[PDB]
Amino acid sequence: NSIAIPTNFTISVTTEILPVSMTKTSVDCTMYICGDSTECSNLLLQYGSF
Amino acid sequence: VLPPLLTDEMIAQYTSALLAGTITSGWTFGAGPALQIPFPMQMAYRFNGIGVTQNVLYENQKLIANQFNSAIGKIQDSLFSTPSALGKLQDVVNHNAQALNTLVKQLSSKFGAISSVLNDILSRLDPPEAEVQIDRLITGRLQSLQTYVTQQLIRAAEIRASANLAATKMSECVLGQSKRVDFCGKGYHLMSFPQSAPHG
Amino acid sequence: NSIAIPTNFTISVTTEILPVSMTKTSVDCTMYICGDSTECSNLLLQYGSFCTQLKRALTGIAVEQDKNTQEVFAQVKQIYKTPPIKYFGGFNFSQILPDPSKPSKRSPIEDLLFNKVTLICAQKFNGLTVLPPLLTDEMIAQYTSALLAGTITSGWTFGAGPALQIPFPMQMAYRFNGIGVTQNVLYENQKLIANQFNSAIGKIQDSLFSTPSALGKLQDVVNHNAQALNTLVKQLSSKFGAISSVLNDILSRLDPPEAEVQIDRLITGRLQSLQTYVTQQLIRAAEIRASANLAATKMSECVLGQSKRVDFCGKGYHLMSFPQSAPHGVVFLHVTYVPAQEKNFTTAPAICHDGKAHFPREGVFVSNGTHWFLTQRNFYEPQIITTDNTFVSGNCDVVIGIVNNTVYDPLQLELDSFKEELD
Amino acid sequence: YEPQIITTDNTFVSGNCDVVIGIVNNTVYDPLQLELDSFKEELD
Amino acid sequence: VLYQGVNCTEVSVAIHADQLTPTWRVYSTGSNVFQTRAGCLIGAEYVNNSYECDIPIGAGICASYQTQTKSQSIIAYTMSLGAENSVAYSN
Ligand SMILES: *[C@@H]1O[C@H](CO)[C@@H](O[C@@H]2O[C@H](CO)[C@@H](O[C@@H]3O[C@H](CO)[C@@H](O)[C@H](O)[C@@H]3O)[C@H](O)[C@H]2NC(C)=O)[C@H](O)[C@H]1NC(C)=O
Ligand SMILES: *[C@@H]1O[C@H](CO)[C@@H](O[C@@H]2O[C@H](CO)[C@@H](O[C@@H]3O[C@H](CO)[C@@H](O)[C@H](O)[C@@H]3O)[C@H](O)[C@H]2NC(C)=O)[C@H](O)[C@H]1NC(C)=O
Ligand SMILES: *[C@@H]1O[C@H](CO)[C@@H](O[C@@H]2O[C@H](CO)[C@@H](O[C@@H]3O[C@H](CO)[C@@H](O)[C@H](O)[C@@H]3O)[C@H](O)[C@H]2NC(C)=O)[C@H](O)[C@H]1NC(C)=O
Ligand SMILES: *[C@@H]1O[C@H](CO)[C@@H](O[C@@H]2O[C@H](CO)[C@@H](O)[C@H](O)[C@H]2NC(C)=O)[C@H](O)[C@H]1NC(C)=O
Ligand SMILES: *[C@@H]1O[C@H](CO)[C@@H](O[C@@H]2O[C@H](CO)[C@@H](O)[C@H](O)[C@H]2NC(C)=O)[C@H](O)[C@H]1NC(C)=O
Ligand SMILES: *[C@@H]1O[C@H](CO)[C@@H](O[C@@H]2O[C@H](CO)[C@@H](O)[C@H](O)[C@H]2NC(C)=O)[C@H](O)[C@H]1NC(C)=O
Ligand SMILES: *[C@@H]1O[C@H](CO)[C@@H](O)[C@H](O)[C@H]1NC(C)=O
Ligand SMILES: *[C@@H]1O[C@H](CO)[C@@H](O)[C@H](O)[C@H]1NC(C)=O
Ligand SMILES: *[C@@H]1O[C@H](CO)[C@@H](O)[C@H](O)[C@H]1NC(C)=O
């Protein structure tokens, strides 16, 4: 038969941080793999549509 | 790096719209047309929401306002002082920067080829051996790209989960009042305010 | 001291579409990599148990899709049925309940949804097979029919335990109480509410029929799976440095000790293709699992009950929801209460009557310029401010913005009229 | 299930009987009128 | 045994011609060969009685080991979604 009742209060402001997005990147393989080379590009064509 | 469709100014404008709506109309703008209400009455109804009568707010209005203002000042001080306050967004940026750095650095690798520079291979050798060396390099670079794209897909799934959580928080904490414990802050949720941050 | 109080409302029905499952695929590597070749198979054995991993991953995805459908749709204990007399207080559910006429017992909206989205394995077969889902479309339709019958005939009680019958106007009156509007608002405007709901359902049918991109999510899932499989089959035509992409040409032309080199090049290429395909399928399956978990939560909280979560079960104050099946997904019709035609009023925190401050119990004090009334916040219904309508706490000197006005106590007036005179 | 006598304390009034569909005639027992009657109907 | 994605006629013709590759053969009684959308199911007796799903085969058909017609055999069946309940709705 014991209860604790509040008699005062506090207005507490807390912070939550949530990521929403990430840097958008675009990659051309033909430059990365075979930069400015026709020969390497023809070799890369044999690997299909990766 | 492609730019985001919404500039930081547009995100700030959306956040400003959300603050104006919640300040001037409470939950009614979330649920339909924005219906004006005096802010003390709005906070009295949020007090009723948590399970406290309106007269508690109206009799202690000045104390509540002072506590809120002091709390906002402490929020500013806490964000300013602690270096690791924004660790999540900086972690996302750091992970993307790492991934790209590793992807570029994999180009300097040979993967068994005589040289990592394609121009050296084409300048030194005839076709029927430059093809072998270039095929070794192609295999290495394709493996690097596949790994990078896979990590980006997994991290994008994680960020999509985080963004869905953020959208739910915006819907239930800002545009209304949530009875879900610890969802919209520690304690009995009164209200919430969104702020924009880089990528979050 | 200005407040806008609604004076009318709109019963708004919105649509949400959620993917639940994805096409189940099974892949034999020994056919894809080395189709009908013993030699290439022996070479493939040297790469270890990669095939076991691919088979296990695809089987896990396949079981997970059935699990997703089971979690979203099989939330009901008993297949409930609507009564023979399809009268529900003027609410016309004919466009969401099953149509007994057609060979498939699906509602008209379910037929539109299924028509919109588009044992010989004629296409893509190089060891790639499509396993059927454990629940046919008829079974999903039966589960959805059970959910509609349960929610129509018993409201939230079938979700929370045994299905307890209730007249539908009373159910909607209790949902009205749920959003914060009194029952008399519904009962006095029952015909208007029913007409608005029926018109909204008709607009849902028109909107789904007209817009080509209405069902973009499910079609996107189907398109992604179709792409993935097309790319997987098309990678077979690649050489990957080998003299030919056709294994039979390699075995017919060359002796073993060089056909092995060419076949090893091809094996490496095809193994890379399969690993990439399985990884994309795993990531997309994780995405679909998240979507299916969301759909299950929506079914639990919007259909089997009433949700106080803002924007979770539609835009506006959630009244109820209706599920509909669609190919590889679920379509929730969210019925919500939207306030409308707000009117301008002056307001005050409290009323000072006899040196004591009076606060509303359930409502807000408003003023039409000349008189003060108490009104429920989500609908304008002015009432005389009385001691039954308000509660007293403190004196008039504390509350900021307190306004003097008369608070009519009934008992004193009655006692006066009763026996002031005695003779 | 906990049946109670329908009283003015248990219910609230809004509108007349001609609007609600399916309204049923029944007695609503107001306590105060009954008490005042028993209290001083006679005065002597 | 479920031969996935194949008509039972094709499997039978393969068995009689000794073309089918897995050399083991499930004995066909002429009544335990059933056609499902998932494939040809050999070794399970289909029954009209509907039971809760035990071993999912697919396309609504499950299978279970049950004591049928006095001896226990693997039966196949269309799964039951649940017991019916007609709520006593009224005005
Ligand atoms: C409930 O708690 C609040 C605080 O959370 C109490 O209000 C606080 O009361 C103290 C003591 O009266 C105030 O301290 C004094 O404030 C002024 C500042 O200029 C100064 O004169 C003194 O040096 C002393 O520090 C304090 O400011 C005040 N806080 C606020 C926000 O107003 C309140 O009394 C408590 N109520 C009950 C019923 O216990
Ligand atoms: C609250 O809004 C509803 C509508 O959302 C109002 O009911 C609408 O009242 C108008 C005017 O009386 C009706 O228009 C008329 O309807 C008939 C159609 O046959 C025709 O005689 C007229 O040409 C005219 O168009 C409208 O139908 C009716 N809507 C519904 C769904 O019943 C209602 O009056 C508003 N209440 C308040 C207090 O403002
Ligand atoms: C509930 O609403 C539906 C509409 O969503 C009502 O369906 C109505 O059904 C009839 C056919 O049964 C539709 O065609 C009509 O049929 C006869 C043919 O002789 C003719 O009178 C008309 O020219 C028309 O072609 C009718 O269009 C359709 N209603 C609408 C608005 O499309 C259904 O009757 C409603 N149920 C209740 C209980 O109100
Ligand atoms: C504010 O509301 C009051 C009460 O509804 C209005 O006063 C009533 O006006 C009607 C007009 O037909 C009379 O029949 C009643 O006898 C009036 N009641 C009282 C208590 O005066 C008043 O006109 C309204 N004022 C405005 C500006 O809308
Ligand atoms: C409500 O009425 C009270 C009186 O019942 C007003 O209080 C008086 O205010 C005048 C202001 O000039 C003082 O001179 C009197 O001494 C006050 N009397 C009492 C008994 O307090 C009060 O101002 C009124 N409030 C409003 C908002 O009209
Ligand atoms: C409830 O009682 C009222 C009377 O107090 C009934 O209203 C009467 O209905 C009869 C029907 O034949 C009419 O002839 C009378 O003129 C009506 N009188 C009044 C004063 O309205 C009403 O029908 C009863 N309702 C129910 C459901 O029994
Ligand atoms: C309400 O009235 C005030 C003047 O009393 C006016 O300025 C305000 O614009 C009105 N509200 C609306 C929504 O028009
Ligand atoms: C199997 O073939 C027969 C004809 O030989 C055909 O009638 C039947 O529909 C086929 N089974 C399926 C499941 O299509
Ligand atoms: C409810 O009342 C209407 C009145 O038109 C009637 O048509 C309908 O059959 C009644 N419902 C039941 C279940 O008796």
Author numbering:
A (entry chain B): 710 to 759
B (entry chain B): 860 to 1059
C (entry chain C): 710 to 827, 849 to 1153
D (entry chain A): 1110 to 1153
E (entry chain A): 610 to 679, 689 to 709
Q: What does the article say, verbatim?
A:
We investigate how mutations and a deletion in the KP.3.1.1 spike protein (S) affect hACE2 binding and antibody escape. To investigate the effects of N30 glycosylation introduced by S31Δ and two RBD mutations (F456L and Q493E) on the structure and function of the spike protein, we determined the cryo-EM structures of the recent SARS-CoV-2 variants KP.3.1.1 and JN.1.11 along with engineered variants JN.1.11 + S31Δ+Q493E, JN.1.11.1 + S31Δ, and JN.1.11 + S31Δ. The spike proteins exhibited three conformational states: “one RBD up,” “all RBD down,” and “flexible” (i.e., one or two RBDs disordered in the density maps due to flexibility).
Compared to the JN.1 spike protein, KP.3 carries two mutations in the RBD (F456L and Q493E) and one mutation in the S2 domain (V1104L). Previous studies have suggested that the S31 deletion and potential N30 glycosylation may alter the local spike conformation and enable the RBD to adopt a more “down” conformation, potentially enabling escape from certain classes of pre-existing neutralizing antibodies. CryoSPARC 3D variability analysis demonstrated that all spike proteins had similar proportions of up and down RBDs, suggesting that S31Δ does not influence the conformational dynamics of the spike protein. Similar conformational states (“one up” and “all down”) were observed in the spike protein structures of KP.3.1.1’s ancestors, including BA.2, BA.2.12.1, BA.2.75, and BA.2.86, which showed both “one RBD up” and “all RBD down” conformations.
